[PDB]
Amino acid sequence: IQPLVCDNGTGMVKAGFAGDDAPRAVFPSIVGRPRHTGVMVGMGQKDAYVGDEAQSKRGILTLKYPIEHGIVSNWDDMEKIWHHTFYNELRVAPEEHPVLLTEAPLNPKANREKMTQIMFETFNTPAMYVAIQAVLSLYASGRTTGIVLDSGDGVSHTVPIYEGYALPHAILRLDLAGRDLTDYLMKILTERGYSFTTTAEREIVRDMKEKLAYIALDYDQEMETAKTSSSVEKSYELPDGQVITIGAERFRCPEVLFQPSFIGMEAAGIHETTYNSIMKCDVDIRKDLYGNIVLSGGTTMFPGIADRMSKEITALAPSSMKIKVVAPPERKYSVWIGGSILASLSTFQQMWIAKAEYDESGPSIVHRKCF
Amino acid sequence: IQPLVCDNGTGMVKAGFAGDDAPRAVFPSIVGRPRHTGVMVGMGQKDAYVGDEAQSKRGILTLKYPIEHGIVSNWDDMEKIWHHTFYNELRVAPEEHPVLLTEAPLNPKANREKMTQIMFETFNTPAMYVAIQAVLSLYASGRTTGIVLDSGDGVSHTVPIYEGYALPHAILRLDLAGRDLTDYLMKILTERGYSFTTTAEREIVRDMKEKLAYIALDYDQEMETAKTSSSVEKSYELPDGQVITIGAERFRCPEVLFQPSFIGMEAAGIHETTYNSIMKCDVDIRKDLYGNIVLSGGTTMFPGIADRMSKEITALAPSSMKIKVVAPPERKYSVWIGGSILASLSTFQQMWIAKAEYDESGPSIVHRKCF
Amino acid sequence: IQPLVCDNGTGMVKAGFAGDDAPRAVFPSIVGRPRHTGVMVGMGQKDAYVGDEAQSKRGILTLKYPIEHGIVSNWDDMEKIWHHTFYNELRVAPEEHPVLLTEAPLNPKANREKMTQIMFETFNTPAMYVAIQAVLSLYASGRTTGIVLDSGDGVSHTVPIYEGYALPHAILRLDLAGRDLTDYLMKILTERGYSFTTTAEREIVRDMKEKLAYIALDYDQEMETAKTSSSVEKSYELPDGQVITIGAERFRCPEVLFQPSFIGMEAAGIHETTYNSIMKCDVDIRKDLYGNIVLSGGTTMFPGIADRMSKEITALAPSSMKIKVVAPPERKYSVWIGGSILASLSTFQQMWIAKAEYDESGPSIVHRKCF
């Protein structure tokens, strides 16, 4: 009876039972299709590889995320990911457990409504609820007032909350996330002389982004130090044994997250995003929001992102307020942990919109906006 | 058996037992309502914040004084303040102690009568009495003849008294008080370039009025000195660390209390108010009223208001009479102290109109006009 | 010798000679800066695009209004707009004609004073005057008593006037204007699934606001009708040929102007703004102000705003007084027409503060407060 907490994130799908501490199913939301063979059912190799099988057969597939910046945009491959999780990764009938789902804020209502329609009509979910990822990360942080800055690979949204009482009029969202960081690493590794153009090469560049790239404090001084051949240069073994010496491109990929004009995404920086979310909030809230700024999402796992977020809000904020950038471990999993917290909550048990209630009112039930 | 002395003032509610020297419950009469969330009982955050809790959650609330210039005008939030005091601030059953209540003079009789009705029928008060604030401040001043000039944030009323023998035909009341001073500080800080429009910003402006504003002697000479950048300029830290340099707006807010045409309240100045209350009194009373003019209420806590009241009555009075402007400390609390004096008085124990007497005669009992 | 009437409005700058009927220069107050190229003077493309040139190059620029809610806040780009008008749009030496300027009421005095300083010291204006926009719109309405309700894209201020005799103590100002309507249309088109985040997309959303949005009578009944797919849905061609079907978002953008809590601007509605400006005025003035309420500014060009202003003041006013909501054509240009009227007036020729008088008294001359 432990309800399912499926973090339906952009990059990877995290899923597991409520009341746990780590998801069982941790695998990327990738559906792979072959590119140099026939789809004959007769010999019948397969047709589609989902997640870790797609990661194994990464070479002969056309890997494509079905979702697009939170918008699902492709229902068939998404549904393939759904039943693949439910019947191969967690191995439970979907009518046995309720399904608590996650999303990015400010989504088009057709996405939430048709996702509810598929969960209720294809899988016959007993009951469900769709929650914002940032409120879940705040509940997993163990506090009541903070700003949760999630940036999960398609989105980068900020949400301020003050002792509960969620503020819908200062939630704001960007598009600069880890996908653009991967594409910028493609555009910047062309300077070294290494061709990266395919989806397998895309996943290799994404792996180099995860394991190799750090973030500096002063970008200009670090560019000054990246003139002599110093310790900023580093090698990396490719899966065919090839070695790439990555020099100044270590720190100049997370520089996009604080200078979005380097890829031409005309928007504010993430520090300016959070500071303007503070400025949209009124006074007497700011003192409790300058001191509990909380990072979340997997793209806050850069080494030194907290001290880059410090000295930069500090330049924007007045210099008499405590700038307490809080970045815990398991920032990848904070949304799932908060979903497991709310799914275990007895007070939350009023919020499970049942399929019976879906047949009672109709598909317009999913925008009642309660907690 | 010590009866309750509840100063039901406009700005803050002062309450405490009789025979004390300071009220236990000192908190503003503010009921706050949320403005960016739902009022769902299920999660059930709260619904209303009263006084100091509203002062803590000042940012996310719509703060609103229920009372209006002495007229209560909103019975539900006022009743919320009543039981919040009686069960959270003083922590006593209201049938255990009698309740001595305060009011501004010349109120509409429905306010006093329905307040008596709520104290007798909702709370089951054993006995009560409603007294004028100025007579209480005179009894706390320790004299028998004087003019008490109370101005408590919605009202500014003057009462002359001569050795007892309260004069109902020279009591006169205005509306110019600290609320209009706060709104004038909003209108005058727009010249500096600081937006103040919300109720949280209203309370911040009220705090600046309390802690920063003094009152001059000659307003024209002080405007003459407020042309060079001199010591009249002063800074102030806001709760988000913002700094406002307040220059000539220090002294030009209490200038409204002696020039009410600056906000368009077409009435007499407070000095002209008191002088005309003297002129409404007959001769052989004036000599004992020019020498015992007593300030009271929290809006007489401006630095130098006594010497501004001097030289100004002196210009109105003939120059052969002692103009003795008396302004003690605890002018905020003088009404409560006089209420504690009368509530301790054995002679006053005839005046406690009981709920039994309320059932004896009816709701018209509250206008017998005795001492 | 025809003096310049420059409507220095928030959205667009209207300017022309006195004694005319329409401004020659009608172009938005926008200074554009490039975002994907170098500012090398050698090839020297340009550096800044002003107004209609910025509107032409809307795609490759960072369009930014220099002004901010009446406050100019950026003197260099504003000065660029000034000399661009004077030397490209009207083509006259600024010392040849006097310059009558417009502003929103309750501005910080540094804005008016430094604007006068730039007009007198950079351009060498012969003489000038700064007038409130609402008094100009009343003079262009051809009446002597009314309430002018201007809402020009950064401000929304109301001014009551009774047979001349301007009342400074009932003029009141808000911040809810067309800029917030554009940002709310961004926040509400995210529900349809159309990304609008850049300044070019901002101007496209502003164009859709001008050409597509109407205003309802009963918002709740119109939301009731916006459940079936009815004629409230409508398409719009984007400059790349894209088509957006706008349904209930037609009428729910001007709903912000009568429900400012939908964006969290905690203030009164525009109807409550005007009604409270009436209540700040005394009786015997109200009968001549309930019958001559005059709309002005470009954001009163919504279809049906007069009948929305009716039935809503009528619910606030007593039901025995004529509620005559007057909304002429050319409400965009009414401030400029009234400026052309006063600039043609021989009686007004005492009010032209010359640069010689600026050197006579000093920069404190601009607050003498005469008509």
Add this chain to the structure above:
Amino acid sequence: IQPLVCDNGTGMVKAGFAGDDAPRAVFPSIVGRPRHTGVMVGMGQKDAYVGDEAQSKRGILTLKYPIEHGIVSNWDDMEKIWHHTFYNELRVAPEEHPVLLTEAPLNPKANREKMTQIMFETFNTPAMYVAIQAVLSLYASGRTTGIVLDSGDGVSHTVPIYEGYALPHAILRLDLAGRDLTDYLMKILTERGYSFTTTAEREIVRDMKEKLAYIALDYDQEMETAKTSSSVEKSYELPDGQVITIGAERFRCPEVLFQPSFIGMEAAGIHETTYNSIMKCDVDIRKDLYGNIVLSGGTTMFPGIADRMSKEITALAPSSMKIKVVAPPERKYSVWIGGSILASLSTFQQMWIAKAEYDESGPSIVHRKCF
């Protein structure tokens, strides 16, 4: 003093003086080495044949392009091509004229920097500049806004430009070009039964690609017509008198340029390449880029490539925008003509980085990114 414009293209090297209309030196960038004899200096036949001499001795040589997809990858044979041009083809001392050089965009910086090092240190160039081929082709097209789609035998890069103001964040590059078309013609002539495996046979296949292959409109209908023995079949005389009847292989070689999955180059088609370069650009730029799409490079000389580019962007673009595929004559030479235009420009005379300036700053001068 007419500076050298050397189109350093992949296939052939075009070079000539500035201010002309056609290059003097038009010969392929091929260095040939013997394969059935000794390299004895004693008799001393030769050692290497460059370009047209290699084309004459095509049979007994191992013909090899030194460059590789824009990357030079072989400095000695490239330097042989350089001095062979400068001393046999144009016959001028390289210190007499400045050398304007061309390249494909997104090259590894070592290629540009060491090419500058060789031009400055081996040849002692007086001054130089390296320009993108697409900007040169746009300047030779005589317009200011367009998308130049160059595909010169190793690369196929698209560049959007809007009234100057070069956009570095929508330039994107592929590898599918004429080299892969030649290798696909080898792989597809094996079906006819004609062995092509050597570099002489490679050049013969390249000549058949130039002179024989057209491009269809509907590939499926043209495959339908290529079932009956129709006029799509055609003969060709080889240099030994052999005759090959080429049937459906006429049109199915440029089909690779619009179906890159036929050789397994997992990327977008050239139409999808240009359409995604449009989509990377923002709106208000697209209308001026759907109407001025410009082809360039020698591999746009297929018969009917303009009408194949039409009806295919039209299926991708919305059907309300003018799709004006512009394909001039001399698309081979457009880069050289634009180089002759900029090399004649007096405004461009600031951009000639001298060898003196190379000794001033150092070899890092070649990435200042100015026009």
Add this chain to the structure above:
Amino acid sequence: IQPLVCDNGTGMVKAGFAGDDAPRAVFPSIVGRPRHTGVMVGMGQKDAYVGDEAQSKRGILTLKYPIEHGIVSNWDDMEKIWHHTFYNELRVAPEEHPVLLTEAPLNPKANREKMTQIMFETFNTPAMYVAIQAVLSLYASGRTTGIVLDSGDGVSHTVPIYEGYALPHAILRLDLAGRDLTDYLMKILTERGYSFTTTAEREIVRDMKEKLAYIALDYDQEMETAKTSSSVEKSYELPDGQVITIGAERFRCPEVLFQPSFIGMEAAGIHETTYNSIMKCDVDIRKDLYGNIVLSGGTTMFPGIADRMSKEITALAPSSMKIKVVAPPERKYSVWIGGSILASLSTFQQMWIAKAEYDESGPSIVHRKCF
């Protein structure tokens, strides 16, 4: 009902029933014609000797392989080999069993189509299929991912396969095979002084190639050791008792297979062939192809060809990947064994194109490209 598996190889024709382990008919594909007598039917000696009879009468015949590098090029003698097999070697009616046929990849389609036409119209085959030899050798190797390097006497083709999913865009073929090795042994035995010019002498040279020639590790060091008269010299008895001492010509015949420039076949070496077939494949496939490289065909029966293939791919591959050159026994027969595996497969029973289906669709059926 066991279907025929006829390895239609270049050198010898292997044929036998499915489900066996060795072919019954193992004889060379040679048709012999007399050269010193008349073809009179009257006495009627014979006219043509096929295979082993031609091998017996090797002296008085003009032995000629009908096939040419996979291309059959002579239909009458090939048809003689077909019915000679079917009626003298296996002794079964061809309509009794289906016939699974083998071929080299990239053949001209007329060869496959007319071979199908002869099998269906002359012999009346019930059903058939034509498979690539390398896929058969991989299925006989018992793995799913590898590179099969077949070199059967006319061809030398490499095919990479990854868990099924056959890659048509990295299959590549040469012409250097055992025929050229035999002709090079003719050209190199002229140095010893032994005339070999006839087809009988050709078969004797081929027998010496099979039984006498090994392959070295370092060719230069083995040439260094082939200066003193050492154990590299060896004798051989000819069928007339003649003895040839073969010295350095032992190892210098398979040196052609790794140095194809010694006969002037301008192509890559077999190690460079396989390495470039790896490079044509993408990454994440290479690790499973560097470790399962599989030799096949009879010309991989040289002593030490595995250790020559090692240290040579190892010099080309990076030195951090396992180079596992796998060379089983029965590399001659691996194609036939894999054909017997697929001909026994029940899943493969969809692939038997019947003569009925040949009359259904037509002769274009043989290019449907399924497994």
